Symmetry: D2
Subunit: 207 residues, 4 copies
């Protein structure tokens, strides 16, 4: 049986909801097949987000970690292939930090690849009738920061963990004033559950 | 005052296997909410025949309100239509091979008909339930606009007391697995159409927002 | 033979410093191209007043063909308009503070007027020159659609011999430096408008 | 005087024109300020593209290398910040190669950063009225392959050379049958020349 830690962020910008936390909160305590899921919220703040993730890692001793974030504008569930060593914020984080041209780990690699079997995950989500695709950029805001920090912590200190990041679209209630694509919270939650079960079931990806 | 609301959705088209406009309205057949009593009928995705089928459904049900529904793939909101235009301009053929170009729907009829539904109220009530919606000012020139214009022409000429109009819906997620595109779940689309029926049943007059 | 073609473009609108619809049509003022003799006049971005200025330009030039031009930011092609609708629905005010909502342009006038230009021919002749173009079925509900409906209404009621219509153009690149959006160069837009004027002067009939 | 080598791609399937090559060809032999420019064409083929680039580098001994490719759908000139070590092709290249899940360099790093002052380049192009922005993904097709292979060569053999990649949008004549954003070939060419001059004038970014 594998313990899967999912994280979601609190609302950022002028938002009042973040579908990443709303979806992962629903899966706290869920178990299916080889997966047992636990969820933790991470603040949308550079540096502090990584400290909170490390605390959740110590609390839960997970085998698999899937950090989730919102990518407004996207139309599919998108597991991320690669995290980059760069904080480049177009807007400030929830405490006002707005780093530009900053390394996340000084002397760390330019990038880290995901440790999750994302092609299998994309296919299992599509099998269930929900759109999904691999993404090759997680941005340069707090989501990519958390993804790079997670892979760095895994590489250096906990290599047994299979970890990675999945971005999700807006939910419909976030698109009432400006037209934008969304996926329902029910579908996003289902996709994240499929991701957790798939990662727990397979260490190895397909081609 | 109870109002009978006729909803229509289209039969299967475009290489698709599911026409979501029908999947959604079929769920509402026989539904009763607020002052709305809803009945649903399927219309073929065929120029000319679609309007004959609509007229037959109108005769069968004697509706007070009519809301014809079709799919506008690519849109990201539920979009009640403001205006129907007197033109069939098909870039691909319909289910029976008809591909009209530059054709009037009603020869000598008006260039356009405005909707008879309180669409600004419908957009606001859908958004109050957390579902995106907006007024659209073009229903295209394919069978959806054809049905809308035909519906308004039949109301104007033969049953002016009927309040009718058209609403387009986006793709549902299952239609966007091979080529990315925006969608809304069938559950949210069905709920939005139910809201539109109840809103039109409850209010003859639109708001001015 | 010769056909007098009146082209219009709009005056500056806030936030902008030059309106490209005018910048392009002004370049064609006095041009003799094929059977077209082109003259250009500027119209204010104001409900009601725009139509009065158009009427004066019609009296002044006695045109045979009238093409009003406006900008539809976000579009990716030159787009001649098929239909004008009898509605002013403004999400922001015009240049003189008018923000009509749910208002008829002509009380008792038809719900719509079709264009009088050979727009399919125009689209094909523009594409023949390597410039993107397509027919549009909505001119919006702001001042552009307003001027289009008013032009067709004035033609129908008072000068039925005139062939009139409306063409929207995209942003120019210089308008897309702070927020990404499609554009076409001022040179390509000017060339497309010249082709439209020549095409309309050479053909009353559409393909 | 800095020798700047620009590359553009050969004709690709469906197109009869590769605008990255049409634009850089115009600049072959151009001299402006501190830049002396030369251009070379590379085939849209995995592995062979890198061989042609290495030969061009041997011939010209450039100080600066800017490889250019087309990213249909974008609406700005986009210098790339990062190349990744992966060939993942959804369509075949011009010689039928369709690599899936393959490293570009076995044992090379997951990514390389660009060596060009791309923020300066973006700003100088916008000063001339042309849209531009930094991109953080060059894709996983032949363009990213050429970019990663370039950075691996620089690391490898000539660390002083400053190199990178810039994607350009479609030109209007490629958007007649299916609508899409574009920039004129003259504006793309001017932007690429600004990039070359900016890179030659400045080793450091802003």
């Amino acid at each position: 049986e594998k313990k899967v830690l999912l994280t979601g962020f609190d609302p950022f910008g002028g938002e009042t909801v973040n579908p990443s936390w709303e979806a992962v909160k629903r899966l706290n305590g869920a178990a299916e097949g080889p997966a047992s899921i636990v969820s933790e919220q991470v603040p949308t703040v550079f540096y502090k987000s990584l400290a909170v993730l490390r605390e959740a890692m110590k609390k839960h001793q997970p085998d698999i970690i899937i950090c989730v974030g919102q990518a407004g504008g996207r139309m599919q569930i998108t597991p991320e292939r690669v995290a980059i060593n760069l904080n480049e914020a177009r807007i400030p984080d929830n405490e006002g930090n707005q780093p530009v041209g900053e390394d996340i780990s000084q002397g760390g690699p330019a990038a880290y690849w995901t440790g999750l079997p994302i092609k299998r995950i994309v296919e299992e989500i599509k099998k269930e009738g929900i759109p999904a695709a691999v993404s090759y950029t997680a941005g340069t805001f707090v989501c990519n920061h958390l993804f790079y920090g997670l892979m760095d912590e895994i590489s250096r200190h906990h290599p047994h963990i299979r970890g990675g990041f999945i971005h999700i679209p807006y939910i419909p209630e976030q698109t009432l004033q400006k037209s934008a694509p969304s996926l329902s919270l029910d579908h996003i939650t289902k996709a994240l559950k499929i991701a957790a079960v798939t990662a727990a079931a397979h260490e190895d990806d397909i081609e």
